[PDB]
Amino acid sequence: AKGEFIRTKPHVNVGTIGHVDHGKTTLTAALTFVTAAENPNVEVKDYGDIDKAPEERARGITINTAHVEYETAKRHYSHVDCPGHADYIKNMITGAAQMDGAILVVSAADGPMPQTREHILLARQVGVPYIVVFMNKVDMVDDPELLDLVEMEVRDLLNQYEFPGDEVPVIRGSALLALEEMHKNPKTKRGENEWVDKIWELLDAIDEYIPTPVRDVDKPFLMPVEDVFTITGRGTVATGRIERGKVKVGDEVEIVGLAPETRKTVVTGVEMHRKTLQEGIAGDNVGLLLRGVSREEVERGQVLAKPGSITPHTKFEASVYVLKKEEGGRHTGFFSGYRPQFYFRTTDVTGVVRLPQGVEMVMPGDNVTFTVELIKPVALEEGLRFAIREGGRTVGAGVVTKILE
Numbered sequence: 001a002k003g004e005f006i007r008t009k010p011h012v013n014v015g016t017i018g019h020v021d022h023g024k025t026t027l028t029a030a031l032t033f034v035t036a037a038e039n040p041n042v043e044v045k046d047y048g049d050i051d052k053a054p055e056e057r058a059r060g061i062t063i064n065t066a067h068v069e070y071e072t073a074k075r076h077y078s079h080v081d082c083p084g085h086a087d088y089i090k091n092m093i094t095g096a097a098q099m100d101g102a103i104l105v106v107s108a109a110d111g112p113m114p115q116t117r118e119h120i121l122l123a124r125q126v127g128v129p130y131i132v133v134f135m136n137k138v139d140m141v142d143d144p145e146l147l148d149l150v151e152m153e154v155r156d157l158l159n160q161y162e163f164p165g166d167e168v169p170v171i172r173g174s175a176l177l178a179l180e181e182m183h184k185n186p187k188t189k190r191g192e193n194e195w196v197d198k199i200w201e202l203l204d205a206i207d208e209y210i211p212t213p214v215r216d217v218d219k220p221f222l223m224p225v226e227d228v229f230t231i232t233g234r235g236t237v238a239t240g241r242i243e244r245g246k247v248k249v250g251d252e253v254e255i256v257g258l259a260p261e262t263r264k265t266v267v268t269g270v271e272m273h274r275k276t277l278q279e280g281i282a283g284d285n286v287g288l289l290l291r292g293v294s295r296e297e298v299e300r301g302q303v304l305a306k307p308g309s310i311t312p313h314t315k316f317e318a319s320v321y322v323l324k325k326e327e328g329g330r331h332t333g334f335f336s337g338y339r340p341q342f343y344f345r346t347t348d349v350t351g352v353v354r355l356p357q358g359v360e361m362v363m364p365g366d367n368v369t370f371t372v373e374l375i376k377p378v379a380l381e382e383g384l385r386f387a388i389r390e391g392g393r394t395v396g397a398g399v400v401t402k403i404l405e
């Protein structure tokens with residue numbers, strides 16, 4: 001259960017990306033406190049409410065994406081907070097697959113590090129169109145000469161990957177000190193404190209720089225599944241962001257990828273954050289109670305679709321850019337028969353690279369068209385971006401060009 005969800009404002013999905021320990025979770029937490037001084041309808045989430053898992057506590061990092069909710073005077077936001085650690089890139093990718101825009105967090109003390117670059121590249125391949133930058137940990141850097149160096153480094157870095165690097169907002173602040181003040185005074189408002197106010201600059205930048213997306217409520221329901229868990233009284237919940245269409249309680253949906261046959265079943269509840277909806281609309285980040293299906297039967301990577309709207313595919317043609325050694329790519333070329341991982345939206349699957357009659361070997365830097373045959377069926381579509389990863393690095397970026405099987 002919970003209270004019922006009211007549609008006051010337009011809804012935008014944002015989230016935090018950036019290298020490990022630079023301050024994504026501290027900012028996410030500072031965002032819920034800051035806005036809750038202006039709106040009573042924001043539940044505040046503290047640092048330890050976000051990295052709450054026993055593993056996260058054990059490693060002292062974020063491992064799981066967390067979703068939190070805040071809103072400004074202008075819109076409603078779901079916010080996804082991803083991991084920075086390299087071990088956990090596939091979690092950053094499924095969290096970025098749900099973003100309409102990202103907040104890249106870079107630490108002023110350190111500047112751009114290897115997962116600042118990798119996160120920019122992956123967020124693009126997974127459909128993130130806009131990026132706002134939060135330069136964090138400015139309380140640690142007195143030399144304002146450094147601040148301008150990092151700011152420019154980050155702009156060059158974004159320009160490299162086809163973002164508007166020169167126009168992007170770059171807000172400078174300290175998330176930890178804005179968070180401490182909101183603790184000392186929970187009602188702190190705009191104007192009172194310099195640090196809280198840079199969190200307000202960031203929120204102003206989100207509101208105005210990241211536009212409310214054109215969503216298709218008139219095309220058939222497609223929802224990429226991000227997570228499944230069981231609510232112990234209710235049943236099995238598949239969570240994700242609704243790419244397009246609508247769900248109502250009572251609708252049937254097929255569970256489409258990663259298995260032999262698809263499955264139909266009935267939607268039995270829709271929830272956004274704590275609250276109930278009777279209907280879920282393109283753009284919503286929802287929980288979807290599924291009837292008569294255990295959490296061992298729906299999984300991350302499948303999509304829920306209006307029945308008969310989509311057919312999973314196995315074999316496609318693609319145009320691929322293979323990263324150079326200097327972007328974190330692999331060092332030596334690869335051959336026909338190469339078996340990396342492929343990432344489309346929230347799904348990841350093994351594929352075999354099949355080079356054309358007359359291409360012996362692909363090298364770092366090569367743009368190239370090969371065929372890939374995946375070891376499981378997956379909802380694909382032409383022009384769908386994807387990423388290739390193997391051995392713990394991103395080795396490629398590509399677009400699906402023609403579905404063959």
Ligand SMILES: Nc1nc2c(ncn2[C@@H]2O[C@H](COP(=O)(O)OP(=O)(O)NP(=O)(O)O)[C@@H](O)[C@H]2O)c(=O)[nH]1
Binds near residue numbers: 024060084137139175
């Ligand atoms: N000096 C200082 N420390 C900060 C600031 N913001 C965050 N930190 C500190 O930096 C450490 C990491 O913050 P954290 O939010 O957990 O980083 P992360 O980017 O979320 N983590 P991961 O990549 O594992 O997700 C914490 O000890 C936090 O207190 C800041 O403005 N100044």
Ligand SMILES: [Mg+2]
Binds near residue numbers: 024082
């Ligand atoms: Mg974190």
